[PDB]
Design a protein around this motif. Structure first.
Motif, PDB file in Angstrom:
ATOM      1  N   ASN A 301    -100.045 -32.575 -19.533  1.00  0.00           N
ATOM      2  CA  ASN A 301     -99.793 -33.288 -20.780  1.00  0.00           C
ATOM      3  C   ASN A 301     -98.371 -33.827 -20.829  1.00  0.00           C
ATOM      4  O   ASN A 301     -98.147 -34.978 -21.223  1.00  0.00           O
ATOM      5  N   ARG A 302     -97.394 -33.006 -20.439  1.00  0.00           N
ATOM      6  CA  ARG A 302     -96.004 -33.446 -20.461  1.00  0.00           C
ATOM      7  C   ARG A 302     -95.782 -34.593 -19.485  1.00  0.00           C
ATOM      8  O   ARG A 302     -95.165 -35.608 -19.828  1.00  0.00           O
ATOM      9  N   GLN A 303     -96.284 -34.447 -18.258  1.00  0.00           N
ATOM     10  CA  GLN A 303     -96.094 -35.483 -17.249  1.00  0.00           C
ATOM     11  C   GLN A 303     -96.660 -36.818 -17.712  1.00  0.00           C
ATOM     12  O   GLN A 303     -96.028 -37.865 -17.529  1.00  0.00           O
ATOM     13  N   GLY A 304     -97.855 -36.806 -18.304  1.00  0.00           N
ATOM     14  CA  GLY A 304     -98.431 -38.045 -18.796  1.00  0.00           C
ATOM     15  C   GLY A 304     -97.586 -38.684 -19.880  1.00  0.00           C
ATOM     16  O   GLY A 304     -97.384 -39.900 -19.891  1.00  0.00           O
ATOM     17  N   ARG A 305     -97.080 -37.872 -20.808  1.00  0.00           N
ATOM     18  CA  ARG A 305     -96.214 -38.402 -21.854  1.00  0.00           C
ATOM     19  C   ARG A 305     -94.946 -38.994 -21.255  1.00  0.00           C
ATOM     20  O   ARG A 305     -94.458 -40.032 -21.717  1.00  0.00           O
ATOM     21  N   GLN A 306     -94.416 -38.369 -20.201  1.00  0.00           N
ATOM     22  CA  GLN A 306     -93.134 -38.800 -19.653  1.00  0.00           C
ATOM     23  C   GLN A 306     -93.266 -40.001 -18.724  1.00  0.00           C
ATOM     24  O   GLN A 306     -92.332 -40.806 -18.634  1.00  0.00           O
ATOM     25  N   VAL A 307     -94.394 -40.147 -18.024  1.00  0.00           N
ATOM     26  CA  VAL A 307     -94.574 -41.335 -17.192  1.00  0.00           C
ATOM     27  C   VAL A 307     -94.750 -42.569 -18.068  1.00  0.00           C
ATOM     28  O   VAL A 307     -94.373 -43.680 -17.675  1.00  0.00           O
ATOM     29  N   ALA A 308     -95.315 -42.402 -19.265  1.00  0.00           N
ATOM     30  CA  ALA A 308     -95.350 -43.499 -20.225  1.00  0.00           C
ATOM     31  C   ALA A 308     -93.938 -43.903 -20.629  1.00  0.00           C
ATOM     32  O   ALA A 308     -93.607 -45.093 -20.669  1.00  0.00           O
ATOM     33  N   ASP A 309     -93.085 -42.916 -20.924  1.00  0.00           N
ATOM     34  CA  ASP A 309     -91.689 -43.210 -21.235  1.00  0.00           C
ATOM     35  C   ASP A 309     -91.027 -43.990 -20.106  1.00  0.00           C
ATOM     36  O   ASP A 309     -90.270 -44.937 -20.353  1.00  0.00           O
ATOM     37  N   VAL A 310     -91.281 -43.589 -18.860  1.00  0.00           N
ATOM     38  CA  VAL A 310     -90.702 -44.288 -17.718  1.00  0.00           C
ATOM     39  C   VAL A 310     -91.161 -45.739 -17.701  1.00  0.00           C
ATOM     40  O   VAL A 310     -90.347 -46.668 -17.637  1.00  0.00           O
ATOM     41  N   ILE A 311     -92.476 -45.952 -17.751  1.00  0.00           N
ATOM     42  CA  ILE A 311     -93.016 -47.303 -17.653  1.00  0.00           C
ATOM     43  C   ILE A 311     -92.520 -48.170 -18.796  1.00  0.00           C
ATOM     44  O   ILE A 311     -92.352 -49.385 -18.636  1.00  0.00           O
ATOM     45  N   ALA A 312     -92.269 -47.574 -19.957  1.00  0.00           N
ATOM     46  CA  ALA A 312     -91.791 -48.328 -21.106  1.00  0.00           C
ATOM     47  C   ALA A 312     -90.285 -48.554 -21.080  1.00  0.00           C
ATOM     48  O   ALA A 312     -89.750 -49.149 -22.020  1.00  0.00           O
ATOM     49  N   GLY A 313     -89.589 -48.096 -20.043  1.00  0.00           N
ATOM     50  CA  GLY A 313     -88.178 -48.374 -19.888  1.00  0.00           C
ATOM     51  C   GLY A 313     -87.244 -47.303 -20.398  1.00  0.00           C
ATOM     52  O   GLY A 313     -86.024 -47.510 -20.376  1.00  0.00           O
ATOM     53  N   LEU A 314     -87.768 -46.178 -20.865  1.00  0.00           N
ATOM     54  CA  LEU A 314     -86.917 -45.070 -21.260  1.00  0.00           C
ATOM     55  C   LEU A 314     -86.489 -44.282 -20.031  1.00  0.00           C
ATOM     56  O   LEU A 314     -87.230 -44.167 -19.050  1.00  0.00           O
ATOM     57  N   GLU A 315     -85.281 -43.733 -20.092  1.00  0.00           N
ATOM     58  CA  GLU A 315     -84.795 -42.859 -19.032  1.00  0.00           C
ATOM     59  C   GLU A 315     -85.422 -41.487 -19.235  1.00  0.00           C
ATOM     60  O   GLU A 315     -85.067 -40.762 -20.170  1.00  0.00           O
ATOM     61  N   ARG A 316     -86.376 -41.146 -18.377  1.00  0.00           N
ATOM     62  CA  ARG A 316     -87.052 -39.860 -18.418  1.00  0.00           C
ATOM     63  C   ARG A 316     -87.199 -39.362 -16.990  1.00  0.00           C
ATOM     64  O   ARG A 316     -87.547 -40.137 -16.095  1.00  0.00           O
ATOM     65  N   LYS A 317     -86.928 -38.078 -16.780  1.00  0.00           N
ATOM     66  CA  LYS A 317     -86.945 -37.489 -15.451  1.00  0.00           C
ATOM     67  C   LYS A 317     -88.122 -36.537 -15.297  1.00  0.00           C
ATOM     68  O   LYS A 317     -88.530 -35.861 -16.244  1.00  0.00           O
ATOM     69  N   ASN A 318     -88.667 -36.503 -14.082  1.00  0.00           N
ATOM     70  CA  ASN A 318     -89.654 -35.504 -13.670  1.00  0.00           C
ATOM     71  C   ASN A 318     -88.870 -34.282 -13.206  1.00  0.00           C
ATOM     72  O   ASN A 318     -88.305 -34.274 -12.111  1.00  0.00           O
ATOM     73  N   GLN A 319     -88.822 -33.249 -14.051  1.00  0.00           N
ATOM     74  CA  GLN A 319     -87.934 -32.117 -13.815  1.00  0.00           C
ATOM     75  C   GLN A 319     -88.604 -30.962 -13.085  1.00  0.00           C
ATOM     76  O   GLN A 319     -87.919 -30.207 -12.384  1.00  0.00           O
ATOM     77  N   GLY A 320     -89.909 -30.795 -13.233  1.00  0.00           N
ATOM     78  CA  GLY A 320     -90.646 -29.762 -12.535  1.00  0.00           C
ATOM     79  C   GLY A 320     -91.263 -28.765 -13.492  1.00  0.00           C
ATOM     80  O   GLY A 320     -91.323 -28.975 -14.708  1.00  0.00           O
ATOM     81  N   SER A 321     -91.724 -27.653 -12.924  1.00  0.00           N
ATOM     82  CA  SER A 321     -92.409 -26.622 -13.687  1.00  0.00           C
ATOM     83  C   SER A 321     -92.110 -25.265 -13.068  1.00  0.00           C
ATOM     84  O   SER A 321     -91.510 -25.167 -11.995  1.00  0.00           O
ATOM     85  N   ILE A 322     -92.525 -24.209 -13.771  1.00  0.00           N
ATOM     86  CA  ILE A 322     -92.416 -22.847 -13.260  1.00  0.00           C
ATOM     87  C   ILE A 322     -93.801 -22.211 -13.217  1.00  0.00           C
ATOM     88  O   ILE A 322     -94.070 -21.338 -12.384  1.00  0.00           O
ATOM     89  N   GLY A 323     -94.684 -22.640 -14.116  1.00  0.00           N
ATOM     90  CA  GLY A 323     -96.036 -22.120 -14.161  1.00  0.00           C
ATOM     91  C   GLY A 323     -96.187 -20.918 -15.069  1.00  0.00           C
ATOM     92  O   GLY A 323     -95.571 -19.875 -14.834  1.00  0.00           O
ATOM     93  N   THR A 324     -97.003 -21.055 -16.113  1.00  0.00           N
ATOM     94  CA  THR A 324     -97.290 -19.966 -17.039  1.00  0.00           C
ATOM     95  C   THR A 324     -98.786 -19.952 -17.305  1.00  0.00           C
ATOM     96  O   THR A 324     -99.350 -20.970 -17.717  1.00  0.00           O
ATOM     97  N   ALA A 325     -99.423 -18.804 -17.080  1.00  0.00           N
ATOM     98  CA  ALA A 325    -100.871 -18.695 -17.179  1.00  0.00           C
ATOM     99  C   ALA A 325    -101.248 -17.432 -17.939  1.00  0.00           C
ATOM    100  O   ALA A 325    -100.477 -16.473 -18.016  1.00  0.00           O
ATOM    101  N   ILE A 326    -102.463 -17.440 -18.489  1.00  0.00           N
ATOM    102  CA  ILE A 326    -102.949 -16.328 -19.298  1.00  0.00           C
ATOM    103  C   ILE A 326    -104.469 -16.343 -19.279  1.00  0.00           C
ATOM    104  O   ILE A 326    -105.094 -17.406 -19.242  1.00  0.00           O
TER     105      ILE A 326
END
Ligand SMILES: Cc1cc2nc3c(=O)[nH]c(=O)nc-3n(C[C@H](O)[C@H](O)[C@H](O)COP(=O)(O)OP(=O)(O)OC[C@H]3O[C@@H](n4cnc5c(N)ncnc54)[C@H](O)[C@@H]3O)c2cc1C
Ligand SMILES: Cc1cc2nc3c(=O)[nH]c(=O)nc-3n(C[C@H](O)[C@H](O)[C@H](O)COP(=O)(O)OP(=O)(O)OC[C@H]3O[C@@H](n4cnc5c(N)ncnc54)[C@H](O)[C@@H]3O)c2cc1C
Ligand SMILES: Nc1ncnc2c1ncn2[C@@H]1O[C@H](COP(=O)(O)OP(=O)(O)O)[C@@H](OP(=O)(O)O)[C@H]1O
Ligand SMILES: Nc1ncnc2c1ncn2[C@@H]1O[C@H](COP(=O)(O)OP(=O)(O)O)[C@@H](OP(=O)(O)O)[C@H]1O
Lengths: 539, 538
Positions: A301-326
């Protein structure tokens, strides 16, 4: 101008909706080979058991409301079969049609596909299914007749357990088969032991350390490596996933770890104007700064929101993840974040661990239940690598907190400083998460030395002696209760190394402190008897 | 050495036991003027209602077990009455004895005492009590008789509400009186409104913005400034506490804000070999780096453990606190951490806020309940100043998460990056905490502009127009175009007009705001929307 998105669920729709909010006039086309977009596929296991009563509850937003609210051009039953990155056209199969669509930007969010296990006779099996989408559910529900009695789930990951739990709730006799040595491979063996107990408590048979080699009798018989056979009226394959990269590969999109699609800091592939997000991409494991696959909904969900920001010209970085599960296993909850001990060591990290057993809230307030927490950290700096939790209640909270601490680069020395919402109904003045930090601090600073359950036998075999400090209320063990230890402390042999244990590691640590300061070599059994009896019940 | 500890509860006993684990040979003496040490006084409200059945459940560790386990010299019914920092002796009253005890190090953990308001007839009132220890409880149990029907709680803070809830569960007609304009002063007005609604739903009368002038007829009548009178068979005074500093002052120990004891980075006072911890000391509010009093159990326990580390020769620093609090009001939970909007502004901080209305877990999974979250942050840097939460479930978790974010100095730009334990039973892929960060990023980055409930009237009076985008299934001079029709009916609006968009929740009105902004129409979003506005300004 024209953005085409391949994949219409977590990653793709998150991008599509955010794109519309950023660009009112852009043409946004979403290709989904399946019949629905924005389907709550994560809720499919709970529909099987009936906990989700109606199938419509799983369709988050209808295609009619999506066009009204966001004016999106959504196209189900459209499978993209080719991408020409230079002419910037994709080829699509829709029913009997073969269609060509030009794009200006392309977002790949095809997700992951089930691992095809290497089992003979799968083509002739008629009762073997995966459960990842509505088409899959349709086939599974048509097979669940009143005559179906036994089910087998292959794969004991987080999703594999949700399948087994909800199949048991339907009244089936369920067996769980895991290739790994224990259930929940993402967990460490001693923490997974609490889950296996809960499964057995609820009449779910567990078979570990053995893979499925063949489907015989049209799937009514499952053969295991040892030659043991299982009767099955319904078999669910949940043996993990691999990135759905076939389209990307054919188009020249570079892949890396485990076949994931490689993307840069702006989610862009090696092809011009082609981005990628979701389960299909390689992400950066932030704890190690190395490549990883983290196939979870929250990152997607975050990646999709942020790639939209990129394509729209906003400075947004792909920072990574750590992974949380339950996962919820009947009356138990199991969660983890970051790296387990095994995974941390496998990555070359220098690790130490501590186990804490507390309650979800004050014991004097009714309804308190036991909590088991594990922390994996660096034995000198205190850097936190991961944490695991087991319990009826309060586990999601503690692991969410520890995930946030890792994101903030908090060390074990900062955990005691955290202030939580303490009132008798909700926690303890010293929360179990605070205690992890206190206990971890004692090890780093040399005030305590502990022994791991997997070390105990070898340490006792070498000459160490187990000191049992439980109240009167192992064999070659000296038994001096804590209340008498300070006065009877002279009975012990000062030339002997002792390993102190109780039911919980708190009372044995107090004893260890007495012995250390009296000139007796002593270590604490991390997790104490409660943990050892769970994972090594025989020794 | 010999360590003497004054105060035997959260701070003092946490110091005593940690000291023993670090120094087996040290003489540790704990002086407690009350009858017990390590009593779970935080649970006293729940013993009143009976949710804690037996009183022994509240005595954490018996006096015998403390000497067996930790070899501690605990002395209840010992009230210290003087400290000589040069002679290094304290004077103690024990029944008819006056005793002198020498020390090498001294730890002050005397805690706090009730603020006694200046209400007439207090000394002659027989039904007025505070509830802070077992001696207090013993007095209150004489008032909880079969003939007791009406009770009044004065002060509607976190502890005041616990008293009111547990008295109501005892079957009493309970009324709550708060001097401030709303219940839970620590919260912002629009958030406290959800608590007053839950109190009224459970037949708890609330009187706000009014003080008690007198206790008449031995306390059976309480008169309020308006002239209104209240009948009371039992009155609980929960109007806050002040540091118990009388001993420190008489001994030359320096004090600061609100009389709290001043301590340095190692919990040491201005006097040699005298330390202090707990509710009695001035702490540093980490969000502002300014002095503050944070009278909570979690800091006190931490401070006591760390002053032991200091006295034993370990390197440990007194770093401060931010304050995290929670209360259960029947079927609702209210929690906060850091600074409210009001407190942030009063401290001179530049603040912005956003309100999120979500669920504790996925909506398609049964049992999901509503969540109200508020974030107070810096509108340029994204620094987080505080957060508040309201809801039946999931509030303790969200506020603990945000408290942890503040400690790690995470900004609103980091909140979308947090990964939580998402499964349909436990949360959402985009958790409400993630959602706070997204909505806050849009404000900082200029993609959205919002209007607060307390600004609306002034903005509308100045020429703005309210655009209601609810599905037709009410405000006055409001233009109504449902969201599903707005994209086609967008030409009905006046492009030379400023619009403020509202719905039931701020999500749909934000989507509409984005449409208007890109059509060249000045638009803002009503933060909290109609749901929050109707609660605070009906
Ligand atoms: C049963 C189940 C339970 C889960 N439970 C949890 C949970 O509790 N918590 C959690 O965090 N995660 C959970 N997950 C994982 C979560 O669903 C995924 O991590 C997430 O959906 C990944 O998003 P995505 O967009 O990358 O891929 P997906 O959600 O898998 O979507 C990819 C989409 O692309 C489509 N597609 C692929 N190729 C093409 C093509 N060539 N043309 C057109 N369309 C194409 C697919 O049909 C699919 O609809 C669960 C998954 C399953 C299946
Ligand atoms: C009813 C109630 C409910 C509460 N609920 C919560 C809650 O939900 N969450 C939360 O975080 N906190 C809560 N608290 C607050 C919490 O109890 C305090 O923050 C904490 O106990 C402070 O610890 P302390 O050691 O500084 O002081 P205290 O715990 O008050 O102890 C100080 C001790 O020193 C003794 N003493 C004082 N002067 C002398 C002297 N001269 N000689 C000898 N002994 C002396 C006192 O008798 C007392 O026993 C609650 C408190 C009460 C009373
Ligand atoms: N399972 C455990 N293993 C090791 N140490 C533990 C465990 N559980 C608790 N402890 C330690 O045992 C102590 C428990 O603290 P508490 O405040 O609950 O108990 P206390 O009243 O006896 O001090 C802490 O010790 P420390 O202050 O010296 O750090 C805590 O670290
Ligand atoms: N109360 C609220 N006030 C303002 N914005 C909100 C509120 N609740 C949600 N939002 C926004 O509304 C969106 C909520 O996204 P969801 O994932 O829930 O739904 P979607 O499928 O429409 O994207 C987010 O927008 P953004 O991605 O442009 O940031 C979120 O920021």
């Amino acid at each position: 101008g024209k953005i085409v998105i391949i994949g219409g669920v977590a990653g793709g729709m998150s991008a599509a909706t955010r794109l519309r909010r950023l660009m009112e006039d852009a043409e946004i086309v979403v290709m989904e080979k399946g019949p629905f977009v924005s389907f709550a596929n994560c809720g499919l296991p709970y529909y099987v058991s009936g906990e989700i009563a109606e199938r419509e509850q799983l369709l988050v937003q209808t295609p009619e409301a999506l066009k009204a609210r966001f004016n999106l051009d959504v196209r189900p039953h459209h499978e993209v079969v080719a991408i020409d990155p230079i002419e910037k056209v994709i080829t699509v199969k829709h029913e009997t049609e073969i269609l060509t669509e030009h794009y200006d930007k392309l977002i790949l969010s095809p997700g992951a596909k089930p691992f095809v296990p290497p089992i003979t006779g799968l083509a002739e099996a008629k009762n073997v299914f995966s459960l990842r989408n509505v088409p899959d559910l349709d086939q599974i529900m048509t097979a669940l007749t009143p005559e179906t009695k036994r089910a087998v789930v292959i794969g004991a990951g987080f999703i594999g357990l949700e399948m087994a739990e909800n199949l048991q709730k339907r009244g089936l006799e369920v067996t769980l088969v895991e290739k790994a040595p224990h259930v929940l491979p993402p967990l460490d063996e001693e923490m997974a032991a609490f889950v296996k107990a809960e499964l057995s408590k609820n009449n779910v048979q567990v078979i570990t350390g053995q893979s499925a080699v063949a489907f015989e009798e049209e799937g009514q018989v499952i053969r295991l490596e040892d030659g043991q056979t299982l009767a099955s009226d319904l078999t669910i394959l949940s043996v993990g996933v691999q990135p759905e990269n076939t389209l990307a590969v054919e188009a020249g999109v570079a892949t890396g770890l485990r076949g994931g699609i490689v993307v840069d800091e702006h989610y862009q592939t090696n092809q011009p104007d082609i981005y990628a997000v979701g389960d299909a991409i390689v992400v950066k494991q932030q704890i190690t700064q190395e490549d990883a696959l983290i196939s979870l909904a929250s990152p997607a969900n975050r990646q999709g929101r942020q790639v939209a920001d990129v394509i729209a010209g906003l400075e947004r970085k792909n920072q990574g993840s750590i992974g949380t599960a339950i996962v919820r296993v009947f009356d138990l909850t199991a969660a983890s974040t970051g790296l387990s001990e095994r995974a941390a060591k496998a990555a070359g990290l220098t690790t130490a661990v501590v186990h804490i057993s507390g309650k979800d809230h004050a014991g004097y307030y009714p309804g308190a239940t036991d909590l088991q927490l594990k922390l994996v950290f660096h034995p000198t700096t205190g850097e936190i690598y991961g944490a695991q939790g087991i319990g009826a209640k309060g586990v999601d909270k503690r692991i969410d907190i520890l995930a946030t601490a890792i994101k903030g680069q908090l060390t074990i020395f900062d955990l005691p400083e955290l202030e939580f919402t303490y009132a008798p109904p909700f926690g303890s003045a010293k929360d179990p998460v605070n205690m992890l930090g206190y206990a971890a601090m004692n090890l780093v600073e040399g005030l305590s030395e502990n022994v791991q359950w997997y070390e105990l036998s070898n340490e006792l075999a070498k000459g160490a002696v187990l000191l049992d400090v439980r109240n009167p209320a192992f064999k070659n063990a000296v038994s001096i209760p804590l209340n008498e230890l300070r006065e009877r402390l002279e009975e012990l042999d000062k030339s002997t190394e002792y390993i102190v244990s109780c039911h919980s590691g708190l009372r044995s640590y107090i004893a260890e402190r007495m012995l250390k300061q009296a000139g007796i070599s002593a270590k604490n059994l991390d997790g104490a008897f409660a943990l050892y009896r769970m994972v090594k019940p025989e020794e």
